[PDB]
Amino acid sequence: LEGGALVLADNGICCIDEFDKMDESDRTAIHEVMEQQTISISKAGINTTLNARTSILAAANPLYGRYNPRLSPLDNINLPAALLSRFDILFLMLDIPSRDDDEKLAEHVTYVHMHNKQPDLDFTPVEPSKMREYIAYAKTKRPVMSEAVNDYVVQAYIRLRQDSKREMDSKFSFGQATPRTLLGIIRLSQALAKLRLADMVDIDDVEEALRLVRVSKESLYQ
Amino acid sequence: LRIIWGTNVSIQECTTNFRNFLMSFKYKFRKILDERDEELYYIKQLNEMRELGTSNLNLDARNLLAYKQTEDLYHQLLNYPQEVISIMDQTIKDCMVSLIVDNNLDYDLDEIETKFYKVRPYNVGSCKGMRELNPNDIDKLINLKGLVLRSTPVIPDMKVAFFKCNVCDHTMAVEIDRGVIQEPARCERIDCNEPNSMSLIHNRCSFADKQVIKLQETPDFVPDGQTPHSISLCVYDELVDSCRAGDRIEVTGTFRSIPIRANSRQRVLKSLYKTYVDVVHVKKVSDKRLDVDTSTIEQELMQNKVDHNEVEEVRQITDQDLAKIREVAAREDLYSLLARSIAPSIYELEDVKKGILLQLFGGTNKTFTKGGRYRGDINILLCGDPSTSKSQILQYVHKITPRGVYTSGKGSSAVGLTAYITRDVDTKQLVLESGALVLSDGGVCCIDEFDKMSDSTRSVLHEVMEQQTISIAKAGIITTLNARSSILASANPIGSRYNPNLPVTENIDLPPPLLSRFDLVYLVLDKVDEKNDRELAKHLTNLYLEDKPEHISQDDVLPVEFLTMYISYAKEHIHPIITEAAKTELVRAYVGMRKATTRQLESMIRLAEAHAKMKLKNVVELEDVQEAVRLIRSAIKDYAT
């Protein structure tokens, strides 16, 4: 047996595009994968409970191409949150004009199309050989969480829970934060600690976690 | 000096060292391995076994690793197991009759000299699957862990080559010589000399017994890009009708090689040798999960009895722990401590966890004279918000249950659930494969995302939820079989983020009857408020605070082992027959709850009789009905709407 696109991946990465265009079957499988790293099959010879250990990254568009600012993301978007609860992260990347930002946008686009070389910043982004090198070395640790950060995390969880529930049942409101939200905050804080390469967690990280989380949907309000 | 060619193995020194280790082993491994009353660990086996007339014995590796004079024996039974065991089968009879010398006995000595002996090294050094066996280490004692797919029939093999001369009223005889026969062409020259006149008959000859088994490999580690393999092997006589489909197994054997023919036509062979495994011992049970129904398998038990092979079928007990159990059951915080102990890594989910444990008791297994059977299994459903431990619970139960398979989503079909038919890659013949439904026959059948499943796959479970019997009618196959597994699975809501003010018997995207016939359901709505959330927060964080949650053992939690063994003795030795008081509280409960069908009656009784099994009653009682109907209405949350 050789497997599909996913099973060639394990302890690695995938990528998907136009998720909304896929079948209900792919949804049935990935609804398993994102939470549990197995796959179950009962078709023929293959009766496995096979190991995936993979990391999903999809993409799609809404129903109308451009956003419906007078509808919610929970109506404008096509996918159900019965699945999307598993989606620890979610950005909403839409576009509205501005006289000034698109000027230097075109500057960027035009310089890259002029010669492939990116903008001549005083900066050198670096080969992926070295990048996978650093990723692999940071994959070696397994840091720790103190209580000094645990308590603050607990309070922020309760804050967001009650806030999003009682307040955000409305126009720009997506669902409700979850335990999975908290688990993801935890995982990502761990990863921050892994990147600083200390075996413990600082309070200076959870701030970036929740910052980035509520930052993901800032452009929903403009 | 005495020695074997290409070998560093002495016969008589091995015998002496064997005997001295044997006369000297007294829980040494408790001492030298670790910190952990008794005396002469091994010798009791060899004192007891004599009057019962058995030519077998089991054996560890560690007790050699523990005793002084056995450290070199370890690497030598390892490398030359069939040779070291051709020794030890003799050293064992030697030690036998060197130990009988201190005894006067009734004349049992007509047998032991005629007897044989054999050994079974089982708990041995670990091996990493199949990939490890590059050809450096072929033909060596080995261990493995996995489950079963397919069983073959019996291979016989010539074991006494009978031979009929054509004349002179004479037979002839000759035996196998490293696995061949060299027919004597001659005619016993003295009486008659016809240098190629002789015949062959099968009905005379002696046959061996051999069987082959397809197995699925289930490691603890795999590399980057791995996937299942399916291996064949060979068992031989006196082990037959032991290992079959529906069993996880820890095992041992010897890895080996062999070539095959190019045809049925001539002796031209392959550069590459097909691999295989010859068998040394099998482990059918373990500690981290309970065992088969003792009623289910009676015929197999009495068969093994009649066959005088007694490799295990059921784990065995101690009386001091029986007393321990009658002690632990005297207290009254059973009904919650079981719950707290099922899942220490998780928040309360009380009734949920209690129902899991009550299904793990199962219930009642009665039959009628010819026309009835009523089985201990109650089909279970879950429903509610995502972002909880539903899936985690289910993985946990699928692990801890011995005989069960996991299904997901719409990637399944009636064909891959009931019987399907296929072809072997070696024999190229029409051989079958059992279905994932019937594999769990007794135990767990786990599913996730019940809603999106095909209506073709969802059509079959009409009958399995009633009779534990699938039927087939397809190519060359007509037989209605048995699938006593239980059902336990999740559902997902209609739409997303729920609809609090609606009939939830309509709010699922699932019709009534399929849902009503579930013996019970559980509900996972959110009800966001502190005093249930912050506590859970620390409850799940302090797990991460440690490298692994041992300090979760606080707040009164049991270990897995006393638990599981209590469960097994419970499951295997009590039969609560229904009582009279419970009638009048069960009937009114059902009727008043009807204000949605007659199956929740069967649910209440099959679960209250399990409540009776719990506490170790040999009787049901009125009170079990109380918590039954109580927790039922708590399950679907009667109070809100």
Ligand SMILES: [Zn+2]
């Ligand atoms: Zn003759």
